[model samples]
Target: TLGDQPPPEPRITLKVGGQPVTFLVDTGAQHSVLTQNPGPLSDKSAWVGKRYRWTTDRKVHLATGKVTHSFLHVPDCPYPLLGRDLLTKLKAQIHFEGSGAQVVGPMGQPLQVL
Candidate 1:
């Protein structure tokens, strides 16, 4: 077999305020974290979620579903962390096969996770 590397972490692109951002599929995390803030995303005031407080609030668009959720900013973070709180609310699912991972929508379509 040839020597090759695989993705160290599961990630997917989620749209926020009409902007696309990459996020790590971190099941271990309880809250989603944003590593960067786009200007358009800063207009809204931060709000608290059902499970925890957040520094930011934005509408998360996944597949065709959309919902306003809490998010925290962490510039030093490697990438945005997609936590269980958002996952559970969205009713999303993550499937791992070998070194690859798939983020599924609430219905059935599989998201293109890198």
Candidate 2:
């Protein structure tokens, strides 16, 4: 599974608490990012007092059930990043095949993706 990085195309699109977010699958990232306010309904609370906030620890999906996580909420980011923290609990493996990429679930099952 060692190789060069691929182009950012046909990235993963997820509904984080019903908010559609698309970001590159970044396993190296320890924290996640919302990249924007997400809308007027989004949570903009701070994790570091008046600034450097997290994703209100709830915006990421539970998919199977409602769970909580501290995804970082940054408004000036370049992309809506899907980090290791989310993927750890998300319990999915990121894999890129020769012709394309696909993320598989617990038992080699594919994700509920497009």
Candidate 3:
């Protein structure tokens, strides 16, 4: 359980449009959100029906199944976010220690986030 102090931010490198991009990992977020449309990401017209709630969609990587149903335009969270959806897809978890945040994949194996 998290103590009085917040855990360190976990960072991971993922491929987007064939390019490696680093993003802050947040298991609390429901969908993975990106600040800018990288290269392969495109507007998800499928979410048009949900636009009434001000929610939009964007594909993360065509090769992968990462997608976001929400938009990121706030100044507070300026960096790209790696949300829980992708983490669940990866079967991943983040461990915070004095050294830094560490990402582990399924089967308790350390992930190559770089």
Candidate 4:
């Protein structure tokens, strides 16, 4: 639920292969997205078995499994985004109050950004 205050875009940083990757938390997206040419811990190849418009099956650690996670590869993307797939896996809740934004876990406790 949102408060009277406008909800701020939640941008978070995560560690991928010891490098920090920042992503905007977007609940509207069906799948997470990254640039086709990520610097570290990126798989430019090895996509197979079913394809969607502007999206493909790729392996990434955004979720809690080694399963194939749908990832969109957009060229010249302004920023990376965290989609509902990973957000559902994370069991995250967004709070509109308290400064810009706050993310909570399933237990209604504050979650660490990283």
Tens-digit per-residue lDDT, 1-114, candidate 4: 101101136876654333355677888767676654543333444332543233334444432332345556544446667779877877778778656786666677655435
Model 3: lDDT equals 0.52
Which regions of candidate 1 fall more than 4 Å away from where they truly are? 1-8, 38-53, 111-114
Q: Write the per-residue lDDT of candidate 2 for residues 22-100, one digit (tens) a residue.
A: 7777776677766665433235555532365554445444334445665666666677677777677768777777777
Candidate 4 local Cα displacement, residue 3, angstroms: 38
lDDT of each: 0.64, 0.59, 0.52, 0.55
Error of 3 at 90 (Å): 1.1
Predicted structure with the largest lDDT when compared to the true one: 1
lDDT of 1 by residue, 1-114 (tens): 001101146788767655677778888877687665533333334333422224546777766467887676555557778889888887788778898888887776865422
> Could you tell me which residue pairs clash in candidate 1?
none
Q: Cα RMSDs of all predictions? A: 8.7, 8.1, 9.4, 9.4
Please write out the lDDT profile of model 3 over residues 70-91, one tens digit for every residue.
4332224466677777777777
Clashing pairs in 2: none
State the weakest 10-residue window (summed lDDT) of model 3. 46-55
Off by over 4 Å in 4: 1-8, 39-70
Off by over 4 Å in 3: 1-8, 40-77
Question: TM-score of every model?
Answer: 0.71, 0.67, 0.58, 0.58
RMSD over all Cα atoms, model 2: 8.1
**Stretches of model 2 off by over 4 angstroms after superposition:** 1-10, 38-51, 62-66
**Candidate 1 whole-model C-alpha lDDT, 0 to 1:** 0.64
